Design an enzyme around this catalytic site. Structure first.
Site, PDB file in Angstrom:
ATOM      1  N   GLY A 118      32.087  60.821 -69.300  1.00  0.00           N
ATOM      2  CA  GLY A 118      31.911  59.364 -69.136  1.00  0.00           C
ATOM      3  C   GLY A 118      31.275  59.007 -67.804  1.00  0.00           C
ATOM      4  O   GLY A 118      30.107  58.578 -67.814  1.00  0.00           O
ATOM      5  N   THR A 169      33.201  70.757 -75.032  1.00  0.00           N
ATOM      6  CA  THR A 169      34.541  70.472 -74.447  1.00  0.00           C
ATOM      7  C   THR A 169      35.137  69.211 -75.084  1.00  0.00           C
ATOM      8  O   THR A 169      36.376  69.157 -75.204  1.00  0.00           O
ATOM      9  CB  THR A 169      34.471  70.304 -72.922  1.00  0.00           C
ATOM     10  OG1 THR A 169      33.818  69.068 -72.626  1.00  0.00           O
ATOM     11  CG2 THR A 169      33.746  71.438 -72.229  1.00  0.00           C
ATOM     12  N   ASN A 181      26.614  74.843 -69.632  1.00  0.00           N
ATOM     13  CA  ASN A 181      27.753  75.678 -69.166  1.00  0.00           C
ATOM     14  C   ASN A 181      27.768  77.009 -69.927  1.00  0.00           C
ATOM     15  O   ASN A 181      27.851  78.054 -69.253  1.00  0.00           O
ATOM     16  CB  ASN A 181      29.091  74.941 -69.282  1.00  0.00           C
ATOM     17  CG  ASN A 181      29.328  73.946 -68.165  1.00  0.00           C
ATOM     18  OD1 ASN A 181      30.091  73.002 -68.335  1.00  0.00           O
ATOM     19  ND2 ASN A 181      28.691  74.145 -67.021  1.00  0.00           N
ATOM     20  N   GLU A 234       7.470  68.215 -53.210  1.00  0.00           N
ATOM     21  CA  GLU A 234       6.395  69.097 -53.752  1.00  0.00           C
ATOM     22  C   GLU A 234       6.643  69.382 -55.237  1.00  0.00           C
ATOM     23  O   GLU A 234       5.686  69.217 -56.018  1.00  0.00           O
ATOM     24  CB  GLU A 234       6.291  70.425 -52.993  1.00  0.00           C
ATOM     25  CG  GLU A 234       5.228  70.455 -51.907  1.00  0.00           C
ATOM     26  CD  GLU A 234       5.613  69.798 -50.592  1.00  0.00           C
ATOM     27  OE1 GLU A 234       6.049  68.630 -50.623  1.00  0.00           O
ATOM     28  OE2 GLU A 234       5.480  70.457 -49.539  1.00  0.00           O
TER      29      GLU A 234
HETATM   30  N1  LIG Z   1      30.088  73.547 -64.377  1.00  0.00           N
HETATM   31  C1  LIG Z   1      31.090  72.694 -64.630  1.00  0.00           C
HETATM   32  N2  LIG Z   1      30.956  71.769 -65.583  1.00  0.00           N
HETATM   33  C2  LIG Z   1      32.059  70.989 -65.707  1.00  0.00           C
HETATM   34  C3  LIG Z   1      33.231  71.056 -64.987  1.00  0.00           C
HETATM   35  N3  LIG Z   1      34.123  70.082 -65.410  1.00  0.00           N
HETATM   36  C4  LIG Z   1      33.483  69.453 -66.365  1.00  0.00           C
HETATM   37  N4  LIG Z   1      32.226  69.954 -66.600  1.00  0.00           N
HETATM   38  C5  LIG Z   1      31.252  69.465 -67.571  1.00  0.00           C
HETATM   39  O1  LIG Z   1      31.520  68.105 -67.828  1.00  0.00           O
HETATM   40  C6  LIG Z   1      31.918  67.893 -69.205  1.00  0.00           C
HETATM   41  C7  LIG Z   1      33.142  67.008 -69.231  1.00  0.00           C
HETATM   42  O2  LIG Z   1      32.872  65.776 -68.506  1.00  0.00           O
HETATM   43  P1  LIG Z   1      33.627  65.419 -67.133  1.00  0.00           P
HETATM   44  O3  LIG Z   1      32.776  65.823 -65.972  1.00  0.00           O
HETATM   45  O4  LIG Z   1      35.040  65.895 -67.189  1.00  0.00           O
HETATM   46  O5  LIG Z   1      33.650  63.825 -67.209  1.00  0.00           O
HETATM   47  P2  LIG Z   1      33.287  62.762 -66.075  1.00  0.00           P
HETATM   48  O6  LIG Z   1      31.802  62.617 -66.015  1.00  0.00           O
HETATM   49  O7  LIG Z   1      34.048  63.130 -64.846  1.00  0.00           O
HETATM   50  O8  LIG Z   1      33.924  61.432 -66.694  1.00  0.00           O
HETATM   51  P3  LIG Z   1      35.314  61.185 -67.472  1.00  0.00           P
HETATM   52  O9  LIG Z   1      35.099  61.763 -68.846  1.00  0.00           O
HETATM   53  O10 LIG Z   1      35.532  59.692 -67.490  1.00  0.00           O
HETATM   54  O11 LIG Z   1      36.370  61.924 -66.686  1.00  0.00           O
HETATM   55  C8  LIG Z   1      32.101  69.292 -69.809  1.00  0.00           C
HETATM   56  O12 LIG Z   1      31.611  69.332 -71.143  1.00  0.00           O
HETATM   57  C9  LIG Z   1      31.266  70.205 -68.906  1.00  0.00           C
HETATM   58  O13 LIG Z   1      29.955  70.392 -69.397  1.00  0.00           O
HETATM   59  C10 LIG Z   1      33.370  72.037 -63.974  1.00  0.00           C
HETATM   60  O14 LIG Z   1      34.340  72.238 -63.231  1.00  0.00           O
HETATM   61  N5  LIG Z   1      32.223  72.827 -63.863  1.00  0.00           N
END
Ligand SMILES: Nc1nc2c(ncn2[C@@H]2O[C@H](COP(=O)(O)OP(=O)(O)OP(=O)(O)O)[C@@H](O)[C@H]2O)c(=O)[nH]1
Ligand SMILES: Nc1nc2c(ncn2[C@@H]2O[C@H](COP(=O)(O)OP(=O)(O)OP(=O)(O)O)[C@@H](O)[C@H]2O)c(=O)[nH]1
Ligand SMILES: Nc1nc2c(ncn2[C@@H]2O[C@H](COP(=O)(O)OP(=O)(O)O)[C@@H](O)[C@H]2O)c(=O)[nH]1
Ligand SMILES: Nc1nc2c(ncn2[C@@H]2O[C@H](COP(=O)(O)OP(=O)(O)O)[C@@H](O)[C@H]2O)c(=O)[nH]1
Ligand SMILES: [Mg+2]
Ligand SMILES: [Mg+2]
Lengths: 428, 440, 440, 430
Positions: free
Chosen positions: B144, B179, B206, B254
């Protein structure tokens, strides 16, 4: 007098210059702090050609180190003999061209040059009689190409009679270290052909070839490629700095290398360069063979495909002028095919009693040939494939350049390639 | 002076951020307190940091980075962390209630409250900066906050700051491993915004990077923290040219010129090549010519697009360490000769190369080998289209049923906005084939 | 620079491999860590190893060898061994489930999964190599992996690498002593694939070499490990010319030209002559003219074909040590004069010779005497036909009953492939007589 | 002047060259580091014939060391006087010919020769007056035979007037140290007979015989065989490098040794060679050395001159000998060998005198004999080649490189024409 103002433009130019001002300093006995510690009084009789004598008896390069990236100052300062250059002559922007000719000519570059011209005017007036300039700049990037050609355009409108010299690194298709190289070079040569007197084209492809074959280096860096370009850059303007059994200068070379005004692209080639292990007898005939070898030319185009419209050797050290002449004659009788039928006695000669440091004899070759086509066709063919689709064109368009420029640049460059080809096939 | 503002939005953004700032701190020699130890009796690494850290004038260096989340948990972990005394308290902006994997919450309901405070923080950081190079942004387009607020930021940043380059490192959801169920909805609504307001968008999936850890680092059970460390090494290698001296220097301004041939085509891939477990490092030569070939491996791409389907429109090879430009030359030349690697006709020369002398840093507790050479290749490929077609297919299954729309509509997003977004992404994958088509 | 990639496929292949790399490590002075001790204050044996070992640039030499098995046990014994730190972890490729003495498993079912990973490993090794001389391959045509996958490799290598020579050292099952019942089926299906894709195939039957151990080394109870050591000495002697300086130098590309007179006749025998127990090394002179006569003994042949039935089409004598080319001269000349040794009319100038100054290395715990002279004769003989006729007879008893076919057919080998293979081997033993026939 | 450019092509060729350039360095007093440490000023008067004077008073051999195998460089560097040779002149491939004329002529060697010609031209142009070339190669191997014959074809097209001398090791049936020798050697002679001015056929069999009979060596190595070839190689071109009572040169020998253009195969042989324990008993006189040079044993070719009949011969005597005594011996021999000397063309033997002997010797001789015996050595190669070609054995290698069966048949035809022509001039009475 007959002074020369050097303008080292772009990350390429500032590095070529840095090595050039080391090389030229060794010849004149100047140390990195500017003081004279030379053993021969000949080393200071014509120093004023390149240096401006400063108070406390310091010697300063007539060098204007221009760029649009402030990180290249930290490069030329870090270098040995970096403390030679005048801090007022350093003229550096903030953003950078972004390998974009439009940015380095029409916007970001167009706001700095007015600061550079004031410095060019300042160092040009201080000379009693100005022989010319010697800009050093790549046609591959945006800063070197853009500002370079814009400066070259400006300084020509102010100083029409003075000799505009230009040691320019053309983008080789083998290396291709930048993607938008073709666009930069194509817009570059359009401006250079109008507003440069003589343009010694250099290639990284040919400079790597000299380091892997002629010399045998295990790790050729850009410092070693620079060290070749400088040796030649010294040799072209030597007879100004030292006596001669037969003297020369930039204008004398231009009058004998440029048959027609638009044919002023040349291949430079330094003769006595040898692998450290393979150290060969050092005689005028042995040096004349290597400078005319299509391996030694610092240009991707092999002369063998083309024909020499004219040549010029600037022999160094204590050599018999008869022996030199004999070798120049001999060469023209062997290579009857590689010397234009009309304009006989094609090859010019020049002697300079003073050799380069740690050598008995040397040479510097300069050859206007119809081979030089074959390096501008590569840039053309490439550039065309891009411009059919208007690829990477929104960048250059975005900086206020029109599609009319890119088309006339191709038009004007195809006219050059048309003009050389005429004089190759021409029989008189 | 080579300043780069880093905007870390959402959990994925912040947690990737944490790993980036561990690496930067180690690279410039900044300790967790934010005071470099004045050693070698000379400022030898002086002004290196000015890219990423701002000298307070009291000997304390502060990261030029805004960590933004609508959820308090992730940012709290930073505040109760080893680097609590590194990051400026105001820079670490928090929200009370998360967007909860809903673009709409992040774009309208909740985001609009927090974005006002964020921009003020970016303006304060942009004032300190003299000749800012660009805005690096880190957002997950599956989630989100990263989708919604992360899109809203970029829109607002584009008007306020204008020219200044916005390079967006985005964690697009891998098709096999997802996820969250509502990811496709978020991703598409995010991409439409991102398609206009970003200059260059580096895609990272990921699952792809998970597979690299199992293949190169030989870890049976990789974590996000192991993943985030590989992401950091890429970012480090990209900005490196600014921070450390090099033979052939590049800049963030660049890539823009050398990688995006048409305004909308700004999507990219990436591949840091010498990812090697210290176990197998013993037995590898690791010459430049191998590292280059290893970069153009279909597997070593950090987004899960197989570039053999596509044609390389531009490549940006960024070398670090004991790298000779002659050696790089032959390596590219052999790649240009290969059949598996195919280039568009209209890009006759499609390599930007950058050579830094500085070798990459080995993070302690880090799944990597200390290696004397490296390369980060950011590539514009026609293969990127494949990821967008899957996210379009996976979406078109939804919005046939109107499958989760009631959430998005309830939080201020009109239903036609979904239809708009899909129509614009369908217009992108039309463009990606059109440029792929050989010259007429 | 004289580089040779060694592909060890199947148990027999790997276990032969181990013994080869013990010898090569001892010859070049490489220790089990992979670091030669820099002694004599000069690089005196410098570049000798570049044939078989690749310098990593850090003082560790890695074998240019891929060890391949569909079974994890044999490759695991190498990983939990003295030379664990010598071999690159990736080069040592493993499978989960063995082919189980079924060509079909090795060619189709299982092999098609692993061959993809092996070719990538061969390409990475071939990239490091500058002027590669050829691919040495070690397979057992009695077993599944060596027959099935080993054939699939050679096919795939022939298209990918083209001209580069493929010398195959094959462990054809001896007729009297057979380890497995289904060997004939494997052998024939393997030979048809091997008949096309290998340049020179050197045949070695275990029973024959077992007999040599009982006769020359005077061991009542020889093992495989004792056998593998004799196989290593042959391979060492063949590639010697590259690694060590010699008066009359040969190369892997020469034998090709100087042994196979027609494309399909590429099958050969081999005989290393001064195989002597240190016990009887006292009583012997061991002159060149005895070593040569000891090479053309019908018993000393390492494949169990008696060459007195056949005619020697070509011969490649490869001497090592205190060898004078004048002494070799008289030795060949006397052999050319003998009646027992018979030559095809169409090869009146028999015997290629190669003379190395380097004497062979005495492996510690090795059943051999340190000897100042040696020779490895690889011979193209019309007698090879005999081995193929027995493997055809032993096969024709089967496939009259369709005896084990259900296994091979169940794993994706069409029944007609057996009939195809037998018809092509029947066409070989036709060719071997046709060349044996005196000129018309 | 009258400078000579040496090309040592193929492993065998390089190893001969190595020993040759050691042998000539002793006579000219050049030390392995290229410094002159000779006692006599006669040693440097004509040094330019073989050496080009480099800077700092270093003397560099005018040698072009070509091979398709890179391992051969290490071997010529390893040798004493290995530093002499200039590094640019060394031109080496990677793969090697594989004892294959085709690979060394049509494919692998076809790529390299363009690089060698550029070195050949370079050293050839440096000479004010080029006498010609001395190519040292084996007909038996791939490299020496393939590139050797291809280079020889190339140099001759560029330099037709300049002498093309070749010291070639022909494969002997006794040794037969390669299986495909007959193919290589048959395809070689075809190219050599059209493009070589004077070929001196050498054989390992004969050299071993000289080492087991004339000299008494327990262990004759390729080192010692090469030493004999070198000793002769000096003899053939001495009157260039030193003064003489009667002077000769390569062209002079050619003019008197070659009656018709296609008969330019000769048998070289060195006279003063003696077993070390048979030196007391032996007296060193012109008659004694003349006896050994016309002994069929002494010749470095398998074929005994007794079977053939000398079309001509040439002796290049060394040291301070009365020319009358030499002339008395050359006459005496011709009266003795009535049958072995052709009826037409009387006074068959030519004689040259050089004042300067070889080091550690008072007198010496080098013999060059155009006979119809040399035929007999070529018949061995023909008989052996035919047998292989009856059935097209080992042919697919040569065919694989892109040589056609037409080439193999024209090679056999041309060598059969050579064999017929010698047999004509043997049998011919006039
Ligand atoms: N590389 C990496 N990707 C992550 C990680 N945590 C979440 N993601 C990515 O982010 C997705 C989930 O979204 P979040 O980042 O948890 O959500 P947000 O943008 O913080 O927003 P909310 O859903 O409101 O919490 C997953 O499908 C991953 O692709 C992390 O620790 N490392
Ligand atoms: N010289 C030698 N030959 C061996 C050895 N082990 C097996 N062989 C040969 O190989 C045959 C058996 O095949 P394996 O090598 O076990 O089979 P594989 O090719 O490994 O395939 P799998 O059956 O899938 O394991 C025997 O009949 C022998 O001829 C060994 O240690 N030394
Ligand atoms: N000879 C030489 N050429 C260089 C060097 N650096 C860059 N170049 C070449 O110049 C081009 C890039 O120019 P550069 O000056 O870096 O970009 P600009 O600053 O935008 O002009 C490339 O095509 C390079 O091949 C150098 O140090 N020496
Ligand atoms: N006299 C002599 N003959 C040699 C020597 N080395 C090799 N040969 C002969 O040359 C033949 C093979 O030719 P070689 O030049 O070695 O192979 P190439 O280099 O591939 O042409 C063999 O049959 C040998 O008898 C040597 O040192 N002396
Ligand atoms: Mg969250
Ligand atoms: Mg097995």
């Amino acid at each position: 007098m007959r002074e020369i103002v050097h303008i080292q433009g772009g990350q390429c130019g500032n590095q070529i210059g840095a090595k050039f001002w080391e090389v030229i300093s060794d010849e004149h006995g100047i140390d990195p702090t500017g003081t004279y510690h030379g053993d021969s009084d000949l080393q200071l009789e014509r120093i004023n050609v390149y240096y401006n004598e400063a108070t406390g008896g310091r010697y300063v390069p007539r060098a204007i180190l221009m760029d649009l990236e402030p990180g290249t100052m930290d490069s030329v300062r870090a270098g040995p003999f970096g403390q030679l250059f005048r801090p007022d002559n350093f003229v550096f922007g903030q953003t950078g061209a972004g390998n974009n000719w439009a940015k380095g000519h029409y916007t970001e570059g167009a706001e700095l040059i007015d600061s550079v011209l004031d410095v060019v005017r300042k160092e040009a007036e201080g000379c009693d009689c100005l022989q010319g300039f010697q800009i050093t700049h790549s046609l591959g990037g945006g800063t070197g190409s853009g500002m370079g050609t814009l400066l070259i355009s400006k300084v020509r409108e102010e100083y029409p009679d003075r000799i505009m010299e230009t040691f320019s690194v053309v983008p080789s298709p083998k290396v291709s270290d930048t993607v938008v190289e073709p666009y930069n070079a194509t817009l570059s040569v359009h401006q250079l052909v109008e507003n440069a007197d003589e343009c010694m084209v250099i290639d990284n492809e040919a400079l790597y070839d000299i380091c892997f074959r002629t010399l045998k280096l295990t790790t050729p860096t850009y410092g070693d490629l620079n060290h070749l370009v400088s040796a030649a850059m010294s040799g072209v303007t030597c007879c100004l700095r030292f006596p001669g059994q037969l003297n020369s200068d930039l204008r004398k070379l231009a009058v004998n290398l440029i048959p027609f005004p638009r044919l002023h692209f040349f291949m430079i080639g330094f003769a006595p360069l040898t692998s450290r292990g393979s150290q060969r007898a050092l005689t005028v005939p042995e040096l004349t063979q290597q400078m005319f070898d299509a391996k030694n030319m610092m240009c991707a185009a092999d002369p063998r495909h083309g024909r020499y419209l004219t040549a010029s050797a600037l022999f160094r050290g204590r050599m018999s002028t008869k022996e030199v002449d004999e070798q120049m004659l001999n060469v023209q009788n062997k290579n009857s095919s590689y010397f234009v039928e009309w304009i006989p006695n094609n090859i010019k000669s020049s002697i300079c009693d003073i050799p380069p440091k740690g050598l008995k004899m040397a040479v510097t070759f300069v050859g206007n040939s119809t081979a030089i086509q074959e390096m501008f066709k590569r840039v053309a063919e490439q550039f065309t494939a891009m411009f059919r689709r208007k690829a990477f064109l929104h960048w250059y368009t975005g900086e206020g350049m029109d599609e009319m420029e890119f088309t006339e640049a191709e038009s004007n460059m195809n006219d050059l390639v048309s003009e050389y080809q005429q004089y190759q096939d021409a029989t008189a | 002076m080579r300043e780069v503002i880093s905007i870390h939005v959402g959990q994925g953004g912040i947690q990737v951020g944490n790993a980036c700032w561990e690496l930067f701190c180690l690279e410039h020699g900044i300790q967790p307190d934010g005071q470099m130890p004045s050693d070698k009796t000379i400022g030898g690494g002086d002004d290196a940091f000015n890219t990423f850290f701002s000298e307070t004038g009291a000997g304390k260096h502060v990261p030029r980075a805004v960590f933004l989340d609508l959820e308090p948990t992730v940012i709290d972990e930073v505040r109760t962390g080893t680097y609590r005394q590194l990051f400026h308290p105001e820079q670490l902006i928090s929200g009370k209630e998360d967007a909860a994997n809903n673009f709409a919450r992040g774009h309208y309901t909740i985001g609009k409250e927090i974005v006002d405070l964020c921009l003020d923080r970016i303006r304060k950081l942009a004032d300190n900066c003299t000749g800012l190079q660009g805005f690096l942004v880190f957002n997950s387009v599956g989630g989100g906050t990263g989708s919604g607020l992360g899109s809203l930021l970029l829109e607002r940043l584009s008007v306020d700051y204008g020219k200044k380059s916005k390079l967006g490192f985005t964690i697009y959801p891998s098709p096999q491993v997802s996820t969250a169920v509502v990811e496709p909805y978020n991703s598409i609504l995010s991409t439409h915004s991102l398609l206009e307001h970003t200059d260059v968008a580096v895609m990272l999936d990921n699952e792809a990077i998970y597979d690299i850890c199992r293949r190169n680092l030989d870890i049976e059970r990789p974590t996000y923290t192991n993943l985030n460390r590989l992401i950091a090494q890429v970012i480090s290698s990209l900005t490196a040219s600014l921070r450390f001296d090099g033979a052939l220097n590049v800049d963030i301004t660049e890539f823009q010129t050398n990688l995006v041939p048409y305004p909308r085509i700004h999507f990219m891939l990436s591949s840091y090549a010498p990812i090697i477990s210290a176990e197998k490092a013993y037995h590898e030569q690791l010459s430049v010519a191998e590292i280059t070939n290893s970069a153009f491996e279909p597997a070593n791409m950090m987004a899960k697009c197989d570039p053999r389907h596509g044609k390389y429109m531009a490549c940006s090879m960024m070398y670090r360490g004991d790298v000779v430009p002659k050696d790089v030359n032959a390596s590219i030349a052999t790649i240009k000769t290969k059949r598996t690697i195919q280039f568009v006709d209209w890009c006759p020369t499609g390599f930007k190369v950058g050579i830094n002398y500085q070798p990459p840093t080995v993070v302690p507790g880090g799944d990597l080998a200390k290696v004397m050479r490296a390369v980060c290749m950011i590539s514009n490929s026609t293969a990127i289209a494949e990821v967008f077609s899957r996210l379009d297919h996976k979406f078109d299954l939804m919005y046939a049923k109107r499958a989760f729309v009631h959430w998005y509509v309830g939080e201020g997003m009109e239903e036609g906005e979904f239809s708009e977004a899909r129509e614009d992404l369908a217009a992108l994958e039309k463009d990606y084939e059109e440029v792929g088509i050989e010259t007429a």
